[PDB]
Design a protein around this ligand. Structure first.
Ligand SMILES: C[C@]12CC[C@H]3[C@@H](CC=C4C[C@@H](OS(N)(=O)=O)CC[C@@]43C)[C@@H]1CC[C@@H]2C=O
Ligand SMILES: [Zn+2]
Length: 258
């Protein structure tokens, strides 16, 4: 009886195995745009993905992960609210059963169709596993998806999903350029938070871009054909793999923009 997104194992159950679920810096949150304070001390975000080297795409029974070779200093996130340099290890999405839900963060209670997370670890802690034990261990870049025009840079991901339908399936996925998933503007909100799945560790500086990307209805419909279940198990469509907004408690959301 492992955690998931269902009635009996979903977000309202996670606190039993992971008591930090009710902690002081949980993610995601609602971004109240009128309360978020413009912080002139925040720097432009530096996203350097020119040398990013993807290895594999994996269905882990929760989402699909596009994984990167993080063995050299290549694909790095720095500046913005960050001190030092954070290395890209993987990206994944959260999405809904319908276009009206799927994002984890919300903006004035607006839910987007999906949300992309690019996960980076602080190079001062040497590897990903050590970084998540630190309050400044990870920087996750969050990007909202709305349904409209296709995102050409997403199509290579969409076209490989047929090969990883079920939990435990993986495929070679080299030479994927994550620059093709970025909106025009790097205007962002930032706040201290957590992983949004177990183990829910309070190790993340969240950087949520204001500008969504557009994807087509056809692109998101292919996300919704994935399965939570393993090959030769009862079909459970991989949909609504999002955690709802958690209490903000004693935190401030800062805006990079006026
Ligand atoms: C691999 C680990 C468990 C899985 C952890 C990872 C740290 C960050 C995320 C990101 C998160 O999703 S999200 N939404 O918070 O970005 C989904 C869980 C995941 C992959 C841990 C690092 C060490 C630990 C075990 O070795
Ligand atoms: Zn995520």
């Amino acid at each position: 009886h492992h955690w998931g997104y269902g009635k009996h194992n979903g977000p309202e159950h996670w606190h039993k195995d992971f008591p930090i679920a009710k902690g002081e810096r949980q993610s995601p949150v609602d971004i109240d745009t009128h309360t978020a304070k413009y912080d002139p001390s925040l720097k432009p975000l530096s996203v350097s993905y020119d040398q990013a080297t993807s290895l594999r795409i994996l269905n882990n029974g929760h989402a699909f992960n596009v994984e990167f070779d993080d063995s050299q200093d290549k694909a790095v996130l720095k500046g913005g609210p960050l001190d030092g340099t954070y290395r890209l290890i993987q990206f994944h999405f959260h999405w809904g059963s319908l276009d009206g839900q799927g994002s984890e963060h919300t903006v004035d209670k607006k839910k987007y169709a999906a949300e992309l997370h690019l996960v980076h670890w602080n190079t001062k802690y040497g590897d990903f596993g050590k970084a998540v034990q630190q309050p400044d261990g990870l920087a996750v870049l969050g990007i909202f998806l709305k349904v409209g025009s296709a995102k050409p840079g997403l199509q290579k991901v969409v076209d490989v999903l047929d090969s990883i339908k079920t939990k435990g399936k993986s495929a070679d996925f080299t030479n994927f350029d994550p620059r093709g998933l970025l909106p025009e503007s790097l205007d962002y909100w930032t706040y201290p938070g957590s992983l949004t799945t177990p183990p829910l560790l309070e190790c993340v500086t969240w950087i949520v871009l204001k500008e969504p990307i557009s994807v087509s209805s056809e692109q998101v419909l292919k996300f919704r054909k994935l399965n939570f279940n393993g090959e030769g198990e009862p079909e459970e469509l991989m949909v609504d793999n999002w955690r709802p907004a958690q209490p903000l408690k004693n935190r401030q959301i800062k805006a990079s923009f006026k």
